[PDB]
């Protein structure tokens with residue numbers, strides 16, 4: 001009966017501990033209590049409380065889709081990190097399971113999680129390059145070598161998650177974080193993650209991902225599996241190359257109905273892209289998932305595509321390129 005007793009020992013306290021203890025505790029969330037995974041963040045007398053033990057950086061800047069991610073500092077240690085707020089009432093444990101104990105360089109490092117009142121505060125390493133989405137806004141669009149470089153890295157993270165039977169569920173540039181120099185990319189924002197065998201995504205309370213990157217099986221209410229992440233990642237590739245999401249420049253009225261009815265958006269592949277770049281995007285945008293490339297398959301092909309155009313040579317932030 002021991003799992004029960006391990007969980008009760010964690011409840012009512014913030015402790016220094018390991019990812020597996022955190023995941024056990026967070027399942028009861030899905031008053032001050034949590035597990036912190038690094039000695040950079042430390043509890044003080046069984047507690048870790050906002051504005052008492054850790055402080056958000058002033059003035060409060062606000063990042064993420066809901067401005068729910070902030071820079072913060074542990075008052076005792078002085079170490080800085082990022083914190084994501086999730087409302088307790090809609091917290092999904094899968095978000096932690098996707099990044100807890102997952103020592104992979106393409107997954108944002110998790111430093112811990114603490115429940116305080118109506119919040120779940122999720123602590124993680126601070127990546128200073130900004131998001132891939134922000135990078136696209138600033139540059140207009142990315143050159144092909146850089147676009148192949150970051151898609152590869154994203155697919156390395158999806159390989160990792162898929163091998164663990166975890167599906168990201170919202171793969172897009174806004175959820176890829178860059179290192180301070182731009183050379184390392186990491187998946188974040190696992191709030192739509194799902195633990196797998198495949199079956200329909202559209203049942204009960206499920207909150208789905210971003211409409212423009214939705215795979216047709218998601219939209220039609222069909223059996224979904226890891227392959228939905230591949231579709232989205234190729235929609236992300238189109239976003240990088242063109243500087244706008246797929247589907248938006250040909251349709252405006254509800255985009256989910258076009259994804260069901262129309263052929264995939266392979267016409268949005270730029271003419272100037274090299275053959276294998278085009279080939280790879282086509283293999284990730286096959287409508288039926290059985291015919292669509294896995295993460296492993298597509299990552300190998302995106303790797304070769306990049307080699308075929310001379311490797312990564314463009315600077316991280318070059319000159320502006322107007323979106324088509």
Ligand SMILES: CC(C)(O)C#Cc1ccc2c(c1)-c1nc(C(N)=O)cn1CCO2
Pocket residue numbers: 063064065069082084095099108122124125126127128131174177188189190191
């Ligand atoms: C991993 C988890 C908790 O699911 C998550 C997350 C999550 C969601 C949205 C985000 C970020 C992170 C984010 N993290 C950093 C950073 N670590 O430096 C910077 N941003 C800005 C983009 O908005």
